[PDB]
């Protein structure tokens, strides 16, 4: 019955895209973006659950656009909904050209995170209070995503 | 109107899990796994389409368990189905303990890859011929997955 | 001629400390922290100037404590004071252990950054307006730091 | 003792060459190639011996050309010959341009791996039996390499 | 009361600047240079103290210029002056284009390094002896730097 | 006939062994060691020839023992002998435990480096003058290594 507002789990990350992070085209290597998402989704889940977490699954990722070298890479992740031991985490990724001002949504992800105790066994997590228009929409469309997730389980 | 067998597009990775590859929970970093998954999917798509490709969307990553330090990561990637520019890539990860002989299924993943020109625009792709029992099975329930994937996008 | 509030340049970074980030003593390798400091200072300055930046110099780094595996690294940069083409960037770093809720100030640093154009030559920067009392305090004690820093250069 | 075919020990790696993997010229860093080679040889020895392994010595690395950005690195590793507690691993590295369909032989390597116990001491290994013709010719002229290597060890 | 010549502590590092070491502006990413600096400072201090060390603070980092891809990066660190348990470490970083034979001073830095026992507690370090005229000059002007650093900490 | 002393080519490197460098066994990952040798060899060869160089071959690496975490890693490279366009490079690796005083030879390697011009074509390098006892020995035994090297190519 424990309840925290979404704002509590909110995690921001701001990176600078450098040549070691690039692919063979000129944009950021997709794999780096994923490593960032997984990291921020974990921090988000930890802030909310107050315990160690494991990524149960990633329920969706789509690359709309890609950050170029020199861009600022903005990452934002928050807990959108919960089960008893699980937490749906939403991570969105923006590219920001600080020189020209141009900013676009590049990536978007949904992850299921599970909180675990010292011995690695799943642990009850507090439920999440949505407050803003965006949050309240994502809270209500989560059971629809979980039912869709549970059917993605059949091949 | 071109068709190639699955065998053509198959790509195999075999990593050795080292301390830098690990995390605070003594096991492997899930972000490292995603990096290998994206990397091998890219190669798998490329070998099939003979061109540069981008990961359009990651559709599922199911973390069943994970490898410890000193294990061997075994990755298998192959194309399961094709549209006209898009193609489904399947990636399997195994943790293989070379001392004890114990083999474990680490994670399964489904991605959608799109071949592109040097202009960065969707490019016509060859088709895929399933052959083994596994290859046939994944191919048959490929339309059902693409329909399920469509539906997730409408919240 | 141009002015902007501190709030505009503020940059937040949150990291998870993992084994490859650690050193031979079970703490976070100090060399990683400095790298994180430099990247966020560069972002901070870029956000305020809307141009490419170069780190002119680091004026001090102060290692008070340091993060452990599993901790969260919390980094905050913002612009504290400006010159004609230069900007003082203050970066502070916090270790946050989310399991027990313990939070500790790890590092503090003052850098000076210069905005640059196509040719890498100095570019006029907008000034900065402090808002909070910590921000105003830093803006006020900033000319003293530039003086101290000037005097430090001669001492060789 | 036990005897296993070469196929059992065969290990394949395939990688995508990226800018961080490259050197100050157009191509891949030679040190990245070596790290992959040591890793694959280590994996090849383990799958065969079913124990931990150390790299006793590198006997040769022949750099013929090297992969450029966007190439796939095809790496092939297998056991060629066996001693008491030693194993000869041969590593084949290919650059494969998936666009053009151009495939070149990058490098070849011969390594000696030693199986070790919990306390890092030489451990008896199973023997290897060749099945393909190239596997046969590598097996035939194995002692001739070890004889050259022994002679090499004392030319100082 | 113990005493060692600067010469003993001196640590040399030569690196090759590769594309992963670079930034969005063509030269070496400053955050990499700082990591190298911290590392060689630790190695310098470790040689003089014969114990584990921590970077207490950084006095200054002066970026004069920066290296390009393909350059040799030359680092030199030594201990310039000591306290009860602390050591001032000076590091200078030279860019060197071997092809053209052009050597340029890239960075300078002063750090305070504290020697520590097995439980992390600061422990006494031996004193240092300046020998060359440059080493003597740095030794003579060291107290003044600590004074400037002390007054720097007060400027908040 | 152009000629420089061995000392001119000499390159020293001192790294500190951190956990990202370690392997699944407590000691330094051999791969990293190889990467360090290759680097110092290239620097050494560039310094002697005043041009870009390629690592033609590695003629031997001898692993005697390993550096452990927290050790100082000491690498030293110098040109032992020269052909027309090539340079034999000797790389010795020491692990130095700075707390205990223990220093041990962990590795030795011999590399053949080739100097190249702007467009990758080989280029004549100056001959090397040995001076120290160690230097003079390795110079006189280098043709013996050259004969053994070229023979290993036939098998």
Description:
- The structure is a homohexamer.
- Chain A is α+β, with helices and mostly antiparallel strands and 155 residues long.
- Chain A is 25% helix and 39% strand.
- Chain A has helices spanning 30-49, 133-140, 142-151, and strands at residues 3-5, 11-16, 52-63, 72-82, 86-96, 103-116, 127-129.
- In chain A, strands 2-4-5-6-3 form a five-stranded antiparallel beta sheet. In chain A, strands 1-7 form a two-stranded parallel ribbon.
- The radius of gyration of chain A is 16 Å and the shape is globular.
- Chains A and D meet through loops of A and loops of D.
CATH topology term of chain A: Thiol Ester Dehydrase, Chain A
Percent of residues in beta strands of chain A: 35-45%
CATH superfamily of chain A: Hotdog Thioesterase
Shape of chain A: globular
Q: What is the oligomeric state here?
A: homohexamer
Largest sheet: spatial strand order of chain A: 2-4-5-6-3
Greatest interface (CB-CB under 8 A), with counts per chain? C-E, 36 and 37 residues
CA(first)-CA(last) distance of chain A: 35 Å
Count of alpha/pi helices of chain A: 3
Order of helices and strands of chain A: EEHEEEEEHH
Write the layout of secondary structure elements.
The structure is a homohexamer.
Chain A: E1 3-5, E2 11-16, H1 30-49, E3 52-63, E4 72-82, E5 86-96, E6 103-116, E7 127-129, H2 133-140, H3 142-151
Parallel strand pairs in A: 1-7
Antiparallel strand pairs in A: 2-4, 3-6, 4-5, 5-6
PDB class: hydrolase
Keywords: Hotdog, Thioesterase, hydrolase
Assembly: hexameric
């Amino acid at each position: 019955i424990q309840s925290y507002p979404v704002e509590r789990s909110r995690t921001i990350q701001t990176r600078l895209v450098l040549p070691p992070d690039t692919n063979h085209l000129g944009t950021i290597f997709g794999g780096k973006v994923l490593a960032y998402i997984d990291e921020i989704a974990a921090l988000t889940a930890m802030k909310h659950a107050n315990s160690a977490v494991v990524t149960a699954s990633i329920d969706s990722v789509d690359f709309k656009s890609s950050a170029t070298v020199g861009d600022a890479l903005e990452l934002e992740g928050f807990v959108t909904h919960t089960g008893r031991t699980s937490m749906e985490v939403y991570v969105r990724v923006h590219s920001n050209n600080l020189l020209t001002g141009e900013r676009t949504l590049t990536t978007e992800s949904f992850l299921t995170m599970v909180a675990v105790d010292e011995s690695g066994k799943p642990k009850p997590v507090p439920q999440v209070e949505p407050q803003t228009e965006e949050e309240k929409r994502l809270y209500e469309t989560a059971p629809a995503r979980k039912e869709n997730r549970k059917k993605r389980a059949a091949l």
